[PDB]
Design a protein around this ligand. Structure first.
Ligand SMILES: O=C(O)c1cccc(-c2nc(-c3ccc(Cl)c(Cl)c3)c(-c3ccccc3)o2)c1
Ligand SMILES: [Mg+2]
Length: 209
């Protein structure tokens, strides 16, 4: 193909909500329910400030987990423990086995695979995943966060791939928008079985049955 490579050759997976469960937003919704807080209250506090908010600064590696905790508690006030809510949920994270198996099968079939995720520095599971993927890109290690355009350029430069050769799976639609704009294939992971059927369709690799 002189001009354009439309056959997929790389598969990029988000971590929380895709390769590992649960994602934080569900965590917070179920916490609102359990504590009888107004719905969306914790998820609003979590995202307060947008690109300048405490959570983006944590994902970018600008601040550490210990610095973030009292900022999140302040956002909540703007008697539960943020430290406990997050430590309990993070301790209970589990690999999404059907998703991991699909990633391994794509790699066996010659795909370059990568993890691209927003994550945090804990100043107080990844080793396993690392050996089974070609690349691991963590927001707080590179100093960039999804959905900033930059980190998608970094991903493509790391893969040495054009956007049309890449399929990207994420639980968050905002994170797929820049990839879809660049011409990547995108899959929104709301339910793992539907996402795998869609991944089978676009790659032509059997992943189900
Ligand atoms: O989907 C995204 O792009 C996204 C964006 C911003 C934050 C996060 C985010 N996820 C987590 C997270 C992942 C798994 C678990 Cl089980 C939990 Cl409890 C949290 C934390 C996070 C934020 C502050 C402290 C620790 C983690 O931050 C994820
Ligand atoms: Mg996610």
């Amino acid at each position: 193909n002189l001009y354009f490579q439309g056959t997929l050759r790389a598969a990029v997976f988000d971590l929380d909500g895709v390769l590992a469960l649960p994602a934080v937003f569900g965590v917070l919704g179920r916490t609102e329910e359990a504590l009888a807080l107004p719905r969306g209250l914790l998820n609003d506090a979590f995202q307060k400030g947008g690109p300048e908010g405490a959570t983006t600064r944590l994902m970018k590696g600008e601040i550490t987990l210990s610095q973030w905790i009292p900022l999140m508690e302040e956002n909540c006030r703007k008697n539960f423990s943020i430290k406990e809510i997050f430590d309990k949920a993070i301790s209970a994270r589990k690999i999404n086995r059907p998703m991991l198996q699909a990633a391994l099968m794509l790699r066996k079939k010659g795909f370059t695979t990568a993890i691209l995720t927003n994550t945090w520095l804990d100043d107080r599971l990844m080793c396993e995943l690392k050996m089974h993927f070609d690349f691991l890109i963590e927001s707080c290690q590179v100093g960039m966060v999804k959905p900033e355009p930059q980190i998608y350029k970094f991903l493509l430069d790391t893969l040495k791939a054009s956007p049309s050769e890449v399929v990207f799976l994420d639980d968050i639609g905002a994170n797929l928008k820049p990839a879809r704009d660049l011409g990547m294939v995108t899959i929104l992971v709301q339910d793992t079985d539907t996402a795998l059927k869609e991944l089978e369709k676009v790659t032509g690799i059997q992943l189900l049955n």
